[PDB]
Amino acid sequence: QWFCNSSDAIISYSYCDHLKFPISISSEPCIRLRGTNGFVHVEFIPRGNLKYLYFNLFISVNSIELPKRKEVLCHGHDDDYSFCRALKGETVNTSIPFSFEGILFPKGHYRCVAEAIAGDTEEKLFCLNFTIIHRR
Amino acid sequence: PCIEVVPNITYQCMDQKLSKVPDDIPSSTKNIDLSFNPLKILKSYSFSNFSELQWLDLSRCEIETIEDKAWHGLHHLSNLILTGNPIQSFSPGSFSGLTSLENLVAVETKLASLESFPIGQLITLKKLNVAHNFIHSCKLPAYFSNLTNLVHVDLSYNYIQTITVNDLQFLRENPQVNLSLDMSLNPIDFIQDQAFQGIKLHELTLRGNFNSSNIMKTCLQNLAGLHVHRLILGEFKDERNLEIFEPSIMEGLCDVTIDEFRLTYTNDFSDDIVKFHCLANVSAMSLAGVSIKYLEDVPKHFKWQSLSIIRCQLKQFPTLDLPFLKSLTLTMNKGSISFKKVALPSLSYLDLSRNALSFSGCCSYSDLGTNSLRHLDLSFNGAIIMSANFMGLEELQHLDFQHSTLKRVTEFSAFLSLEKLLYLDISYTNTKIDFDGIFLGLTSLNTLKMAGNSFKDNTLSNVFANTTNLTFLDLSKCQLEQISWGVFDTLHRLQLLNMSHNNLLFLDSSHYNQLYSLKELALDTNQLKSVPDGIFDRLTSLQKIWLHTNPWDCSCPRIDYLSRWLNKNSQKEQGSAKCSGSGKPVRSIICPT
Ligand SMILES: *[C@@H]1O[C@H](CO)[C@@H](O[C@@H]2O[C@H](CO)[C@@H](O)[C@H](O)[C@H]2NC(C)=O)[C@H](O)[C@H]1NC(C)=O
Ligand SMILES: *[C@@H]1O[C@H](CO)[C@@H](O[C@@H]2O[C@H](CO)[C@@H](O)[C@H](O)[C@H]2NC(C)=O)[C@H](O)[C@H]1NC(C)=O
Ligand SMILES: *[C@@H]1O[C@H](CO)[C@@H](O)[C@H](O)[C@H]1NC(C)=O
Ligand SMILES: *[C@@H]1O[C@H](CO)[C@@H](O)[C@H](O)[C@H]1NC(C)=O
Ligand SMILES: *[C@@H]1O[C@H](CO)[C@@H](O)[C@H](O)[C@H]1NC(C)=O
Ligand SMILES: *[C@H]1O[C@H](CO)[C@@H](O)[C@H](O)[C@H]1NC(C)=O
């Protein structure tokens, strides 16, 4: 249950219950529910070639779960991100700049799972159960 | 032990906490992934018995020691992968044994230089990947001479700071050598005066190297004297990243000759940089992930033959008038832009897919200004208003509107003028066909993909009568209940016919009589309860048929024919057709004589 806490939001993460391959992932600053430009530090060893990497996001505002969302970070050709060239077994140390614009009037209990998927082979790379809570 | 993804060929021994190699494994195998197992050492003869292996992967296998003659038995291996083993040093003849190797990956193997690297023995080697290592030098070794087939070396995420004359000296000896180099993620600061004199490279890749502009700028100046087929230049959002990026840094590029320039993600950006004059005589400009917002200031003397823009941020469509542009690609924009006319007499290939492109007045000569367009892809965009029947574009042979909102297409014969066209995709365009005359004009057409659409009264109507040459027709997912009388009489050359995922309530034998040439017929997931006797009897050339997911009434004698036909023809049925109620296979039912 790896957590920091901003003074308006407490962020904690953990592995998914049936997928627990390793990652050290971390944000600076610790995210505010309203606006945080900064970096996400990632350390792990990809179980598969990170070219064609993408995510499957299942989010839940106040325990009301949303539809699936599919973010691609690596299209496999001249990719924005350096870690897209990474290979199965090689180490990945990279802080990515992330920019959260916010939500003016944010609410309660958010909750996000994230499946990194190697698009080449559709195999599972890792899975992260997040949590974000407001105020007291 | 391992997973048998493919019986006696491919295995998946990944993360099996395997102390050693396993012995109970077949010898026939052409592939095995052994990654993530604690192998620690690599034994002499550790794979000597196995000897038909093309792909062997030992990524992250904790390896510290490659004993002489370890691979000894693997004379058909083309790909060996060693990513992420702490094999600090490789003994002379550490490999010698591998005769047919084409791809060596030694990424993150704690390697210090190429010179010691015992690979001069490998004649058939094509790619060498040694990125993510401790190399501090770009010196192309002398042993390259021996390596006739090697064309890609990857020196990424290393510690190289300088490229000297002597470093690349091997290449002045060898102008009859094809080679590409990836030098990305190296903190290069100093590239030596006249260090790139008299040398050819195929592609040079320099991204996320340079920290400052005057470092970058100086470095690009001493690139002088170079022929690259393809120059890739940029940085990554997760890196050493430039304070400022001006076109003035492109200076120096005017000395280097370039065939294919390729810019990628850059933090700071101004449009003018692609308009920059040293990029004028390039034979193929290209942009990926680029913050560019407009593109018009484009001198007509620029000799570019293909322009590509991929995942850029254009705010308004290019107005372009390059006389020599033969192939334009503008795909995956961020802005949901709208099409504006162009003038490109050389243009023969146009991919504008996957933007949210709108397009009032499609389409005719005036729109582009060419008589030689052969490939036009408008897929995955938005509102495309059909206002003109392709008059003046009769050379078109490939046309794609997948997932785009075609409008007015049911009002008139919008493809009338496309006498030569061969492939047409209007699937998921949400077209509800009102109009028998929708496909007039299309006499050469071979492939018609139109799944996801719909038909007035849900009735398949007589739209195919002037499309005799159709050999592929996909009408799946079209909410069809019925087929009108005439509708397939003309389709004598058709091989594949898809009508799965519809709501067909019945068949008429008369719809298949003249499909003389039909290899594949899919009628699966419909509402068919039964089939006219003998319906499939004259489909001479049929190889596959799908009939499952339909509530077949299996009462005898009604099910007599179909049940017998399947049992006579099982090799051809794909999937398994079942009786409603019981769920029993249809091939299995027998009737009382
Ligand atoms: C993600 O986190 C939550 C919290 O552990 C889990 O959703 C829960 O898990 C169990 C099993 O389904 C439920 O009975 C609980 O009610 C949930 N917990 C809470 C506090 O609501 C979920 O299983 C986790 N695992 C994932 C997403 O893989
Ligand atoms: C007929 O059309 C159906 C649906 O349009 C095709 O089924 C698709 O098959 C692909 C690959 O075989 C799958 O990944 C998709 O899931 C299928 N789509 C659906 C909606 O199930 C089927 O392949 C076609 N038959 C052919 C071309 O012979
Ligand atoms: C990741 O980055 C930090 C930067 O100091 C470093 O301390 C750590 O060792 C790095 N880990 C790896 C595996 O490179
Ligand atoms: C050199 O090889 C590349 C790929 O390695 C190939 O695509 C190209 O045609 C070759 N270059 C020349 C100039 O023949
Ligand atoms: C289909 O159009 C052709 C092309 O001119 C025409 O000759 C004919 O009238 C049409 N088909 C039939 C059966 O009349
Ligand atoms: C680039 O990187 C290093 C960071 O340690 C720094 O010394 C150097 O001054 C930086 N320059 C610029 C322009 O960012």
CSV table of N, CA and C in Angstrom, one decimal, chain B residues 249-309:
chain,number,residue,atom,x,y,z
B,249,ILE,N,19.9,26.1,-35.8
B,249,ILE,CA,20.7,24.9,-35.4
B,249,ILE,C,20.7,24.0,-36.6
B,250,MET,N,19.7,24.0,-37.5
B,250,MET,CA,19.7,23.2,-38.7
B,250,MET,C,20.8,23.6,-39.6
B,251,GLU,N,21.3,24.8,-39.5
B,251,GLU,CA,22.6,25.1,-40.3
B,251,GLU,C,23.6,24.0,-40.1
B,252,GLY,N,24.5,23.8,-41.0
B,252,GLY,CA,25.4,22.7,-41.0
B,252,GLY,C,24.8,21.5,-41.8
B,253,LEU,N,23.5,21.3,-41.6
B,253,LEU,CA,22.7,20.3,-42.4
B,253,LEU,C,22.8,20.7,-43.9
B,254,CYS,N,23.2,21.9,-44.2
B,254,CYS,CA,23.3,22.3,-45.6
B,254,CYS,C,24.5,21.7,-46.3
B,255,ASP,N,25.5,21.3,-45.4
B,255,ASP,CA,26.7,20.6,-45.9
B,255,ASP,C,26.4,19.1,-46.1
B,256,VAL,N,25.7,18.5,-45.1
B,256,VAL,CA,25.4,17.0,-45.2
B,256,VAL,C,24.3,16.8,-46.3
B,257,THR,N,24.5,15.8,-47.1
B,257,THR,CA,23.4,15.4,-48.0
B,257,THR,C,22.5,14.4,-47.4
B,258,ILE,N,21.2,14.6,-47.6
B,258,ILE,CA,20.2,13.8,-46.9
B,258,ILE,C,19.2,13.3,-47.9
B,259,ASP,N,18.8,12.0,-47.8
B,259,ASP,CA,17.6,11.6,-48.6
B,259,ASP,C,16.3,11.8,-47.8
B,260,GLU,N,16.3,11.3,-46.6
B,260,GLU,CA,15.1,11.2,-45.9
B,260,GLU,C,15.3,11.8,-44.5
B,261,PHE,N,14.9,13.0,-44.3
B,261,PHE,CA,15.0,13.7,-43.0
B,261,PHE,C,13.8,13.3,-42.1
B,262,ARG,N,14.0,13.1,-40.8
B,262,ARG,CA,12.9,12.8,-40.0
B,262,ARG,C,12.9,13.4,-38.6
B,263,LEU,N,12.1,14.4,-38.4
B,263,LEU,CA,12.1,15.1,-37.1
B,263,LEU,C,11.1,14.3,-36.2
B,264,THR,N,11.4,14.3,-34.9
B,264,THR,CA,10.5,13.6,-33.9
B,264,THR,C,10.2,14.6,-32.7
B,265,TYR,N,9.7,14.1,-31.6
B,265,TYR,CA,9.3,15.0,-30.5
B,265,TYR,C,10.4,16.0,-30.2
B,266,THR,N,10.0,17.2,-30.0
B,266,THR,CA,10.9,18.3,-29.5
B,266,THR,C,10.1,19.2,-28.6
B,267,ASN,N,10.7,19.5,-27.5
B,267,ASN,CA,10.0,20.3,-26.4
B,267,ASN,C,9.6,21.7,-27.0
B,268,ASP,N,10.6,22.4,-27.4
B,268,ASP,CA,10.4,23.8,-28.0
B,268,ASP,C,10.3,23.6,-29.5
B,269,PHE,N,9.4,24.4,-30.1
B,269,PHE,CA,9.2,24.3,-31.5
B,269,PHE,C,8.7,25.5,-32.2
B,270,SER,N,9.1,25.8,-33.4
B,270,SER,CA,8.5,26.8,-34.2
B,270,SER,C,8.2,26.1,-35.5
B,271,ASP,N,7.2,26.5,-36.3
B,271,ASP,CA,6.9,25.9,-37.5
B,271,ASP,C,8.1,26.1,-38.5
B,272,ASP,N,8.4,27.3,-38.8
B,272,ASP,CA,9.5,27.7,-39.8
B,272,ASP,C,10.6,26.7,-40.0
B,273,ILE,N,10.9,25.8,-39.0
B,273,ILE,CA,12.0,24.8,-39.0
B,273,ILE,C,11.9,23.8,-40.1
B,274,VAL,N,10.7,23.4,-40.5
B,274,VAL,CA,10.5,22.5,-41.6
B,274,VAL,C,10.5,23.2,-43.0
B,275,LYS,N,10.2,24.5,-42.9
B,275,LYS,CA,10.4,25.4,-44.0
B,275,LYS,C,11.9,25.8,-44.2
B,276,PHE,N,12.7,25.6,-43.2
B,276,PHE,CA,14.2,25.9,-43.2
B,276,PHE,C,14.9,25.3,-44.5
B,277,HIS,N,15.8,26.2,-45.0
B,277,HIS,CA,16.2,26.0,-46.4
B,277,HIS,C,17.2,24.9,-46.6
B,278,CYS,N,17.8,24.4,-45.6
B,278,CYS,CA,18.8,23.3,-45.8
B,278,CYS,C,18.1,22.0,-45.9
B,279,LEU,N,16.9,22.0,-45.4
B,279,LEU,CA,15.9,20.9,-45.7
B,279,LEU,C,15.2,21.0,-47.0
B,280,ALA,N,15.7,21.8,-47.9
B,280,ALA,CA,15.0,22.1,-49.2
B,280,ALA,C,15.2,20.9,-50.2
B,281,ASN,N,16.4,20.3,-50.2
B,281,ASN,CA,16.7,19.3,-51.3
B,281,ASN,C,16.6,17.9,-50.8
B,282,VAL,N,15.8,17.7,-49.8
B,282,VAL,CA,15.6,16.4,-49.2
B,282,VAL,C,14.5,15.6,-50.0
B,283,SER,N,14.7,14.3,-50.2
B,283,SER,CA,13.8,13.6,-51.1
B,283,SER,C,12.5,13.0,-50.4
B,284,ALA,N,12.5,13.1,-49.0
B,284,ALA,CA,11.3,12.7,-48.2
B,284,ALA,C,11.4,13.3,-46.8
B,285,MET,N,10.7,14.4,-46.5
B,285,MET,CA,10.5,15.0,-45.2
B,285,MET,C,9.5,14.2,-44.4
B,286,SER,N,9.7,14.2,-43.1
B,286,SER,CA,8.7,13.4,-42.2
B,286,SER,C,8.7,13.9,-40.7
B,287,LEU,N,7.5,14.0,-40.2
B,287,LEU,CA,7.3,14.5,-38.8
B,287,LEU,C,6.5,13.6,-37.9
B,288,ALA,N,7.0,13.3,-36.7
B,288,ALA,CA,6.3,12.5,-35.7
B,288,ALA,C,6.3,13.2,-34.3
B,289,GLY,N,5.1,13.2,-33.7
B,289,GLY,CA,5.0,13.7,-32.3
B,289,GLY,C,5.4,15.2,-32.2
B,290,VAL,N,5.3,16.0,-33.3
B,290,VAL,CA,5.8,17.3,-33.4
B,290,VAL,C,4.8,18.4,-33.1
B,291,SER,N,5.2,19.4,-32.3
B,291,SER,CA,4.3,20.5,-31.8
B,291,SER,C,3.8,21.5,-32.9
B,292,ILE,N,4.1,21.1,-34.2
B,292,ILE,CA,3.8,22.0,-35.3
B,292,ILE,C,2.3,22.3,-35.4
B,293,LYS,N,1.9,23.5,-35.6
B,293,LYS,CA,0.5,23.9,-35.6
B,293,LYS,C,0.0,24.4,-37.1
B,294,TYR,N,0.9,24.8,-38.0
B,294,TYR,CA,0.5,25.2,-39.3
B,294,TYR,C,1.7,24.8,-40.3
B,295,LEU,N,1.3,24.6,-41.6
B,295,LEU,CA,2.3,24.3,-42.5
B,295,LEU,C,1.9,24.9,-43.9
B,296,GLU,N,2.4,26.0,-44.3
B,296,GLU,CA,2.1,26.6,-45.5
B,296,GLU,C,3.2,27.3,-46.2
B,297,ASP,N,4.0,28.1,-45.5
B,297,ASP,CA,5.2,28.8,-46.0
B,297,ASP,C,6.1,27.8,-46.7
B,298,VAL,N,5.7,27.1,-47.8
B,298,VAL,CA,6.4,26.0,-48.3
B,298,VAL,C,6.9,26.3,-49.7
B,299,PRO,N,8.1,26.8,-49.9
B,299,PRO,CA,8.7,27.1,-51.2
B,299,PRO,C,8.4,26.0,-52.2
B,300,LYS,N,8.0,26.4,-53.4
B,300,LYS,CA,7.6,25.5,-54.4
B,300,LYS,C,8.9,24.8,-55.1
B,301,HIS,N,10.1,25.3,-54.7
B,301,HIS,CA,11.3,24.7,-55.2
B,301,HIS,C,11.8,23.5,-54.4
B,302,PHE,N,11.2,23.3,-53.2
B,302,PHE,CA,11.6,22.2,-52.4
B,302,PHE,C,11.4,20.9,-53.1
B,303,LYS,N,12.4,20.1,-53.2
B,303,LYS,CA,12.3,18.9,-54.1
B,303,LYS,C,11.7,17.7,-53.5
B,304,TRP,N,11.0,17.8,-52.3
B,304,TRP,CA,10.4,16.7,-51.6
B,304,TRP,C,9.5,15.9,-52.5
B,305,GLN,N,9.6,14.5,-52.4
B,305,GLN,CA,8.7,13.6,-53.2
B,305,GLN,C,7.7,12.9,-52.3
B,306,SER,N,7.9,12.8,-51.0
B,306,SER,CA,6.9,12.3,-50.0
B,306,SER,C,7.0,13.0,-48.7
B,307,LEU,N,5.9,13.6,-48.3
B,307,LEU,CA,5.8,14.3,-47.0
B,307,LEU,C,4.9,13.4,-46.1
B,308,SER,N,5.4,13.2,-44.8
B,308,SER,CA,4.6,12.5,-43.8
B,308,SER,C,4.5,13.3,-42.5
B,309,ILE,N,3.3,13.4,-42.0
B,309,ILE,CA,3.0,14.1,-40.7
B,309,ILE,C,2.2,13.1,-39.9
